Amino acid sequence: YDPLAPSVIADPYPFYRKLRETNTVHWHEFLDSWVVTGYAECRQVLGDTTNFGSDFRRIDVEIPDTQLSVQSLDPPEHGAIRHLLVSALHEQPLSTVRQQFAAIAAQHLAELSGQPGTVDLVSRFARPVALRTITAFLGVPPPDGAGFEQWSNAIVRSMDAGIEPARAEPGNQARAELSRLVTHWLAEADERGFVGAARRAARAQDVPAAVLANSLRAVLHAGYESVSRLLGGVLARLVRHPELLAGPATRDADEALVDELIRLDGPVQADARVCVRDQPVGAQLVRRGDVLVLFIAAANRDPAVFPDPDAVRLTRRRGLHLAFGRGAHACLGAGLATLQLREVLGALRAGGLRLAPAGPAAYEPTATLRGLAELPVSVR
Amino acid sequence: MRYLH
Ligand code: HEM
Numbered sequence: 017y018d019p020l021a022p023s024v025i026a027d028p029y030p031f032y033r034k035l036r037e038t039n040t041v042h043w044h045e046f047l048d049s050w051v052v053t054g055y056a057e058c059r060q061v062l063g064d065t066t067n068f069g070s071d072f073r074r075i076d077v078e079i080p081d082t083q084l085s086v087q088s089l090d091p092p093e094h095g096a097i098r099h100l101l102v103s104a105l106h107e108q109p110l111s112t113v114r115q116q117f118a119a120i121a122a123q124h125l126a127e128l129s130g131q132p133g134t135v136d137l138v139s140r141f142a143r144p145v146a147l148r149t150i151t152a153f154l155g156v157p158p159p160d161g162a163g164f165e166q167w168s169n170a171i172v173r174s175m176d177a178g179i180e181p182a183r184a185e186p187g188n189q190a191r192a193e194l195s196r197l198v199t200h201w202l203a204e205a206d207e208r209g210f211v212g213a214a215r216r217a218a219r220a221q222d223v224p225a226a227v228l229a230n231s232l233r234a235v236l237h238a239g240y241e242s243v244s245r246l247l248g249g250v251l252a253r254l255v256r257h258p259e260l261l262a263g264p265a266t267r268d269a270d271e272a273l274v275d276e277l278i279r280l281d282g283p284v285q286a287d288a289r290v291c292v293r294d295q296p297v298g299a300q301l302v303r304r305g306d307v308l309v310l311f312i313a314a315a316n317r318d319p320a321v322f323p324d325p326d327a328v329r330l331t332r333r334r335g336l337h338l339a340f341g342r343g344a345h346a347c348l349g350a351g352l353a354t355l356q357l358r359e360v361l362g363a364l365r366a367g368g369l370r371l372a373p374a375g376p377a378a379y380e381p382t383a384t385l386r387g388l389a390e391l392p393v394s395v396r
Numbered sequence: 397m398r399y400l401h
């Protein structure tokens with residue numbers, strides 16, 4: 017299983033399935049990590065921060081204080097910055113957020129109506145919608161979309177530096193570039209929006225400023241890339257299966273549909289942990305110091321939990337999929353992302369546009385965060 | 397492979 021091989025990138029799920037069917041916890045000797053594809057095993061590891069951590073300092077790896085961030089901190093340090101970010105999120109009025117997200121989606125769909133040629137939904141919809149969405153939520157002016165995507169893409173590709181080490185350095189430069197962007201916003205941002213709220217919250221709580229800046233960069237980059245890649249994958253499915261949008265289109269029906277779309281097309285393919293204390297996982301004894309890569313997109317296709325796992329089924333139990341993670345590090349923006357995809361579905365139905373394939377979905381060589389390079393369609 | 401922004 018070469019995660020960056022073109023045939024794997026074209027469609028990794030059959031390879032995930034072959035892995036899962038042979039062993040839910042495989043040792044990958046060249047990557048020096050456990051590969052976890054079973055739902056039960058991924059759910060176990062995500063929720064157990066006592067024996068599996070995200071802060072490599074807990075296995076005696078040197079991490080400078082200037083690089084600490086909400087994603088790479090474990091209790092008790094994680095709680096302070098986590099609560100700070102959640103408090104800032106909860107201060108945002110949802111009526112305004114939903115109005116902004118709905119208008120952004122409608123505007124970009126309207127620009128596509130009347131296009132007689134082939135249009136790429138990645139560059140023309142998924143990315144620009146995601147960029148304006150996250151910056152509206154943050155309360156900051158959107159940067160140039162093409163330029164921001166270029167810097168952001170370097171960070172995405174750096175998530176695979178364990179496979180291709182040359183990807184690490186461009187990612188570090190890009191992280192520094194986005195950090196200066198966040199630093200400018202912290203200094204100048206209006207009181208309206210998430211940045212203003214996080215700034216207010218930080219004054220009270222006491223968080224290292226470096227953690228706050230690094231954590232705000234995570235909110236920006238996670239918000240942009242996760243939403244962008246989710247929208248692309250969902251659109252890829254809808255263009256091939258337009259019947260998915262021909263359903264009842266009630267609040268409750270779309271709840272089930274959105275849940276299935278996130279389960280199937282959630283872009284996070286891999287979510288890593290380090291073992292802090294020996295613990296059985298699947299058939300294996302995982303040892304302190306071991307790395308585990310949780311293939312959560314594979315876990316969302318485990319047939320023991322999701323029968324007919326590759327299909328949208330509107331009658332599944334809610335709250336099962338792992339596309340937002342689980343436990344202490346569960347996605348801060350899970351509610352924003354579901355609200356956003358809901359509005360996208362609603363804008364598509366009100367737009368009355370039919371989106372037929374004008375060529376194959378083409379996938380970028382990124383293994384940790386799945387993303388389309390191009391999604392060519394005709395608009396009628 | 398690490399989902400780290
Ligand atoms: C505006 C939208 C989003 C924002 C602001 C956002 C922000 C964040 C942040 C800050 C974290 C780190 C939380 C922590 O470590 O305590 C996180 C975690 C996570 N996010 Fe998101 N995210 C967004 C959208 C998404 C989407 C659409 C997906 C997948 C469909 C996703 C998947 C995840 C996962 C799996 C984690 C957990 C990673 C782990 O286990 O450490 N996120 N998100």
Ligand code: NA
Pocket residue numbers: 160161162163
């Ligand atoms: Na641009």
Ligand code: NA
Pocket residue numbers: 303304305306
């Ligand atoms: Na070890």
Ligand code: NA
Pocket residue numbers: 136138139389390391
């Ligand atoms: Na493109």
